[PDB]
């Protein structure tokens, strides 16, 4: 999908020896509503006793990050399992939206390390301003004025004629 962002809150349903059990919350990136509510329990079966049903999911909501046209560079903290090899990482991407730079992580982490997305865990995601971004492929996209004449298209192959007539001479200068 594209990994929207949620804030999912727990309960430990309130049995009589203790009413009002203490309401923990998470920050979950999942493609959909209901899979966000089951990451929550996989990440509750490590920190609190608390399973379903011994617990509840009190109000979650999908959140809609704050500035969708600022050009912030995210820095995510990560934990992932290899073939033999559960490892911490720390990765950085440039994106307008937070859930766009967690899904930027997955398709990159999954390619570069083979990393199937059930063995990746997000352990922090924050915007990191500048002059803290390490990660050389970010901090070359910093310096205004950035000239960069990569004459770029997809250059749609080829066009509406299969047997075209015109020999498309890319450069056009």
């Amino acid at each position: 999908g594209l990994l929207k962002e949620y804030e999912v809150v727990g309960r430990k349903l309130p049995s009589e020896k203790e009413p009002q059990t203490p309401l923990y919350k998470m920050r979950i990136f999942a493609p959909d509503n209901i899979v966000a509510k089951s990451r929550f329990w996989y990440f509750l079966r490590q920190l609190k006793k608390f399973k379903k049903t011994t617990g509840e999911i009190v109000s979650i909501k999908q959140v809609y990050e704050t500035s969708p046209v600022k050009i912030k560079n995210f820095g995510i903290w990560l934990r992932y399992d290899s073939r033999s090899g559960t490892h911490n990482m720390y990765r950085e991407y440039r994106d307008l939206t937070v859930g766009g730079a967690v899904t930027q992580c997955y398709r990159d982490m999954g390619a570069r390390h083979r990393a199937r997305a059930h063995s990746i865990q997000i352990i922090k995601v924050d915007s990191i301003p500048a002059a803290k971004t390490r990660r050389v492929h970010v901090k070359q996209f910093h310096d205004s004025k950035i000239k960069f004449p990569l004459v770029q298209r997809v250059h749609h192959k080829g066009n509406r004629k299969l047997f075209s007539f015109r020999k498309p001479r890319t450069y056009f200068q």
Partner: protein, 223 residues
């Protein structure tokens, strides 16, 4: 002395058919204003509990819709038995199910052949209007009017109209067991656009198990 008898029958069968139509109008009017005060209350409760900074949980769902999704062979004799008792014996049959602890542990058992979720009113209506059939001594009678619910269910329950079926199913009433076992299981057809894996869970791949709001959107393309 026959023609005296029949045209008193024929004019008291008219007055009872007339006294159903108005009694099935203002009864469908009452049932419709429930489903407006209901969903507007859950807006009212959230816009209340936000300003009082409390967390408003909604109600846990009763009334699933359960549809056999996958295959009649290679099935084991304890998922073979739950899916008989849920009346789901073909592919793309669906029944209405009241949810408690006692059938949810049965949907757990029959989990890899079932997708389920909790249905919209539009989904409850469109399933008995477009696809909806009826048991007349093991026969599968369609709907064709609402005499055919008035027959078997008005004398021993108080269901007589088609919206009394919808009311006894959306609001999971006391006569729920009578008005799910009335309806022959809904022989839906194959969703246009497709499934996704049929044999990985909905959280991983997409089918079996709880969709839990998206049985509505699946049933759009299935009905």
């Amino acid at each position: 002395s026959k023609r005296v008898a029949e045209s008193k029958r024929r004019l008291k069968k008219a007055a009872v058919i007339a006294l159903r139509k108005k009694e099935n109008l203002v009864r469908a009017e009452k049932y419709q204003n429930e489903y407006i005060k209901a969903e507007q209350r859950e807006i009212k409760l959230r816009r209340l509990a936000k300003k009082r900074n409390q967390f408003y949980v909604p109600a846990e769902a009763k009334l699933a819709f359960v549809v056999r999704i996958r295959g009649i062979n290679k099935v084991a004799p304890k998922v073979r038995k739950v899916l008989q008792l849920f009346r789901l014996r073909q592919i793309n049959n669906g029944v209405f199910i009241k949810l408690n602890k006692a059938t949810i542990n049965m949907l757990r058992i029959a989990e890899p052949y079932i997708t389920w979720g909790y249905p919209n009113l539009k989904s409850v209506r469109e399933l008995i209007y477009k696809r909806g059939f009826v048991k007349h001594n093991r026969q599968r009678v369609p709907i064709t009017d609402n005499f055919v619910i008035e027959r078997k269910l008005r004398q021993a329950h108080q269901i007589q109209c088609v919206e009394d079926l919808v009311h006894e199913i959306f609001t999971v009433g006391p006569n729920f067991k009578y008005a799910s076992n009335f309806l022959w299981p809904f022989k839906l057809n194959t969703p246009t656009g497709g499934w996704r894996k049929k044999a990985n869970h909905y959280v991983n791949g997409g089918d079996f198990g709880n969709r839990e709001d998206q049985i509505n959107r699946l049933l759009r393309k299935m009905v």
